[PDB]
Amino acid sequence: RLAEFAAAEKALQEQMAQLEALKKDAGLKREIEFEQKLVGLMKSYDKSLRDIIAILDPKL
Amino acid sequence: LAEFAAAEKALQEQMAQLEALKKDAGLKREIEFEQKLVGLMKSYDKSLRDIIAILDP
């Protein structure tokens, strides 16, 4: 009568697993759009990585 | 010839004006880049670290 709370708890632990799979796919999606969006801005303004560092933080 | 000095001088006046507009345009282009860059880094919660890592791994 308790190994029915124990099993419910396993079903949730599984849905938690699927959420994290989904979460990681979104994360990855967002990483690739940043990467593309970054590179495309750098291309349009003719900016290098050194330029970016120069702009945001010359001495790090 | 002093007709070509009137035309010459109006051409200079305009080159001056363009040189001025082009300085402004460089400044503004630089600001746009930086504002866009920072906007995108905020949208995606990215830092300079992350950028260095993506472009120079």
- Rounded CA-CA distance A48/A51 in Å is 5
Give the whole-angstrom CA distance, residue B38 versus residue B51: 11
Q: In this complex, how many residue pairs, one in chain A and one in chain B, have their CB atoms less than 8 Å apart?
A: 41
Contact B33 A49 (CB under 8 A): no
CA distance A30 to B22: 36
Tell me whether residue B51 is exposed, middle or buried, using C-beta atoms within 10 angstroms of its C-beta: 0 to 12, 13 to 18, 19 or more.
buried
Q: Is B36 on the interface with A (CB under 8 A)?
A: yes
Tell me the structure's resolution in angstroms, rounded to a single decimal: 2.3
